[PDB]
Amino acid sequence: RRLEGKVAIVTGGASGIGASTVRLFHDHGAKVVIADIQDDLGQTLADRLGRNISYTHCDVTDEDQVRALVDAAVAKHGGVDIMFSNAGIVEGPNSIFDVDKDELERLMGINLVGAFLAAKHAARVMVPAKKGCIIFTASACTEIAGIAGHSYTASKYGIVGLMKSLAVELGSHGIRANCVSPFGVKLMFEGIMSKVGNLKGKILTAEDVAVTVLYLASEEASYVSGVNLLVDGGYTVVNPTFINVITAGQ
């Protein structure tokens, strides 16, 4: 139990990466507040896990709801040690011709502006306590192109920049900020990832990402801050096209 007594907020934690982090955060002894718009999954998950895991409906585009979410966790557990800003919507690779302004602004509002508000209100409770961790979910697209849509990539770069500015401002008060950038998080999707991944014999699951958030959130990373930690099996470090052409013709 690597977070006994700690208090964690997980936005976007009723499915996906957020839901496995909630389960993991729970196995290691944290108190966790689930914040999501998926009210049915969110409440069912919070009820299955026990008393230290409660659900609160929060649209992270609405600052009133975000402020209420942080205020209520501080009313209930006395403070916020971990903010995991995981809410967002995804976009596979597309064209700049596909980009619609209304949809771009809708995505920016959930992915990027939701992270500002999560950060702004966690910092508001952590700074006077002089401790805390903020973790954002970015994406491997922040390091290599060709795996995500244009709008999604821009919003995820913005999160990295916000995370690094937070790391400076909040470092003065003992507070850490970091990002985790996964890559390729049913059956039709395994075989492609087996073809696409740089590291072989290993498929990335949501549970694996949750483990990396556990590291960054814990006191095993007590001096880690400002880091966008990639979980991509090396995918981002290689362009294999050149080697494929030398090998194909020879």
Catalytic residue annotation: 139, 152, 156
- 19 belongs to the binding site for a second copy (CB under 8 A): no
Q: What are phi and psi of 113, to 5 degrees?
A: -65, -30
Q: Report which DSSP code applies to 184.
A: -
What is the CB neighbour count within 10 angstroms for residue 169?
Answer: 13
CB of 85 to a second copy, least distance (A): 13
In the bound state with a second copy, the residue whose beta carbon lies nearer, of 42 and 156, is 156
**Paired residues of 84 in beta bridges:** 10, 135
CB of 37 to a second copy, least distance (A): 18
Q: Report which DSSP code applies to 51.
A: T
Least Cα distance to 180 among 144, 218, 216, 131 occurs for: 216
**Paired residues of 177 in beta bridges:** 134
Binding mask 136-165 for a second copy (x = CB under 8 A): -----xx-xxxx--xx-xxxxxxxxxx-xx
Q: Count how many residues are written for the chain.
A: 250
Rg of the chain (C-alpha set): 18
Q: Which stretch binds a second copy (CB under 8 A): 13-21, 68-76, 79-87, 194-202?
A: 194-202
Which of 53, 70, 212, 217 binds a second copy (CB under 8 A)? It is 212
Query: Can you read off the two tokens belonging to residue 84?
Result: 């995991």
Which of 37, 72, 129, 211 binds a second copy (CB under 8 A)? It is 211
- 241 belongs to the binding site for a second copy (CB under 8 A): yes
Which of 7, 112, 125, 179 binds a second copy (CB under 8 A)? It is 112
Which of 3, 33, 176, 206 binds a second copy (CB under 8 A)? It is 176
Q: What are phi and psi of 231, to 5 degrees?
A: -125, 80
Q: Which stretch binds a second copy (CB under 8 A): 7-15, 33-41, 70-78, 229-237?
A: 229-237
Of residues 64 through 93, those in contact with a second copy by CB under 8 A are 93
- 173 belongs to the binding site for a second copy (CB under 8 A): yes
Query: Can you read off the two tokens belonging to residue 171?
Result: 């470092």
CB of 109 to a second copy, least distance (A): 7
Q: Which stretch binds a second copy (CB under 8 A): 7-15, 36-44, 45-53, 228-236?
A: 228-236
Task: Give the helix/strand (H/E) hosting 195.
Answer: helix 187-196
Q: Which position has the token pair 């409440």?
A: 43
User: CA 104, CA 150: separation in Å to the nearest integer?
Assistant: 9
